[PDB]
Design a protein around this ligand. Structure first.
Ligand SMILES: *[C@@H]1O[C@H](CO)[C@@H](O)[C@H](O)[C@H]1NC(C)=O
Lengths: 47, 38
């Protein structure tokens, strides 16, 4: 029923550019590493 | 309030001018929002 045959089930976050599946949304503010759109960015940081 | 934008890259839900999305024309939103330019 979908042309992309893979499956991704993880934490869901809604941005004005789209839905981000695969990344957690923290409340901190860091320098932009990987741009997504509509304000937010992505990075690979430890916890 | 004097520059009327068309799409601004936002999510789409009597047909408007944004029916070009169904033919494959999608407008991407900018990285820096207007609250950050301000
Ligand atoms: C997306 O879905 C939510 C849930 O009903 C709705 O409130 C919202 O208006 C929809 N559109 C956007 C652009 O978020």
């Amino acid at each position: 029923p979908t042309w992309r045959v893979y499956s991704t089930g993880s934490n869901v976050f809604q941005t004005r550019a789209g839905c981000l599946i695969g990344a957690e949304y923290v409340n901190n503010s860091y320098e932009c590493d990987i741009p997504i759109g509509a304000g937010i960015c992505a990075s690979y940081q430890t916890q | 309030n004097k520059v009327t934008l068309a799409d601004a890259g936002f999510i789409k839900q009597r047909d408007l001018i944004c029916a070009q999305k169904f033919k494959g024309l999608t407008v991407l939103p900018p990285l820096l929002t207007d609250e950050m330019i301000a």
